[model samples]
Target chain A: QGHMAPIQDPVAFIKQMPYHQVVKELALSRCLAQVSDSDKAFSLDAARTANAMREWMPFDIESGDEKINVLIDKYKSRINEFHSKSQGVTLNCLRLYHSPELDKLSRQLIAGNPDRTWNQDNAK
Target chain B: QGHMAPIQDPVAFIKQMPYHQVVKELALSRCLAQVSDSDKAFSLDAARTANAMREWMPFDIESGDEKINVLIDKYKSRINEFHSKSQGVTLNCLRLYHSPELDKLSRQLIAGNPDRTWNQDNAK
Candidate 1:
């Protein structure tokens, strides 16, 4: 299991993965943009976003249309407001992670705080 | 169709969309990282990546497992090679667009060409 064949074609390879897996991978890829070259701060921020996405975007929902229906019902207003008001650093926060817990983190980012850590009361 | 209620919860709204739509949007969102503030050059590059993604990733495949099966079969080697060799400007090209068309574009990027336009004989 550890040694798989090397990928010859990325597009085709990525195309084969489950749709949600691709979403998560692509979302995680955004973290690479957060750093030009890796450093401590970049690593921490990347881990935080990765953790948040894993929790919020669980793959429980299988149907594409059903997933849309649920999300539209739940987050339509919040996303619009966040997008409307957010700028600069916070502008893309919506693209990073989605969860009620994210509200606290989003507040910190929107307030222009550089602090990346948003501690949980019951830590993971 | 013209006047839907404004989206309040961007995260929830996004979470509900078909997984592929979310993936495409998140991929497109990476373009925001390309510019500090919008400009002509940024706009053109953004459009190029956006267009490429649209062509490369389609919604034809429905099953998550099947999607993975197909992509794994097609692009495994290409992806491994691209990610193995690519760095700097070419580092995230895999994250931007995934297709046979991407081969030429990736070659240009790996060659360190700042020229963004990758023209086709029969244009989209």
Candidate 2:
């Protein structure tokens, strides 16, 4: 069991992470870098949600908004199976669950820039 | 031969990079993130140089200023060997050589913040 250490020396601590965890970190970086390039709306909150999704499954480089969200929705409905199996597991390796708000944010993030609606105040 | 593609689509272009190159990018990201946490002076230029150094060899997460630069200097002396072989190779995968200016920047990056130099002009 890999226990998460407090972050003193972050570099050293990250190295201490299990190999898969390092790969996970790398995966999230790549995903964010890729996503952020095209979608200006993809913020840190959105990134956390994306990381959660990536943790649930492996996505290739070409995977875009549709494929990613389809997986997110698919695995989201099956969270009970994960909880039932791992009773004694520590929170060290815990994956996130999507709340309604987080889900909305995730959708908006992948939706690209939203159209701006000018109001009467704009004329003033 | 994996030919280099243009950067119109950065994500797709990055994915096309060889597996080792992907690993190399991950390694640099990890290094810069960790280094910047401790040393505010570490910048993008330094990160590129560190990437060049990393390309020459593998360093586990534990490597720090001394171990890293030691390898940098060691490899700096052996550029001729690299130049001697692979004559027809394209510039796509060419590793960078450290010039005096870049070397100074890299060292400052790893050296943590320098002591502030308060001058007479500071009392405005």
Candidate 3:
């Protein structure tokens, strides 16, 4: 069955979680920041900085060049996928909204299936 | 002769240069900016962005990790270079300031060197 649970609002969903879980996430983020700062300070020197500028800067430039090529490919694929998926959703919505006969038939099938439940478990 | 000219103030040195030379430097900087912007724009797309995100983000992270190592080596070398160069400069300045014998010898040598030029060309 394609029937699925409705999506909850993100804020309400987070509010429902225990307060302690949020604190844990914040603590983890702080640890990540400390690690990042340590990494940056590790490279602060004139000659090394110059060497890093020479080595890493060129590497960064080359990596950036490759990233651009990758992004162009991604955009073309996603644009194609969006057109296909949008067409499917548009056709389905049209059938459900415009054809009264299809609506009636769909409702009748739902009502006749006595074992079919509309509860939260069924939605899940 | 061990005698050397005093260093010029950076601002004064640059100000004395021709206006056209400064304008040429600015034009070169602008051309560099245009090249940098084009390179960045080349990489902006979703899947390629994601692939770039996946491939480049890690490569960047790894490059960053390596950079830290490079930096530590650089800092140690620079601090040593700083101490050695500072000591040399300090001793030289002290001799220039307090050694009356060296001062008299230097002045006499300058006066005796009639063939030694002291014009703009000598300054350069």
Which candidate comes out best when scored by TM-score?
Answer: 1
Weakest lDDT window of 10 consecutive positions for candidate 2 chain B? B87-96
TM value for model 1 = 0.23
Candidate 3 chain B, poorest ten consecutive residues by summed lDDT: B83-92
Report the candidate with higher DockQ, 2 versus 3.
2
TM-score (chain B) for model 3? 0.21
What 10-residue stretch in candidate 3 chain A is worst by lDDT?
A: A83-92
TM-score of each: 0.23, 0.18, 0.14
lDDT of 1 by residue, A1-124 (tens): 2334554543343434433443444343443333222343333433333333333222333443244333333322232444322221222233343444333333322212322222211122
Q: Is candidate 1 or candidate 2 better by TM-score?
A: 1
lDDT of 3 by residue, A43-97 (tens): 1111122222112111223443233233222222122122101112111111222
Give lDDT: candidate 1, residue A46: 36
Fraction of native Cα contacts reproduced by each candidate? 0.26, 0.00, 0.00
In model 1, what lDDT does residue A105 have? 30
Q: How many backbone clashes does candidate 1 have?
A: 31
Off by over 4 Å in 2: A1-50, A53-64, A67-124, B1-4, B8-49, B53-64, B67-124
What order do you get sorting by lDDT, best first?
1, 2, 3
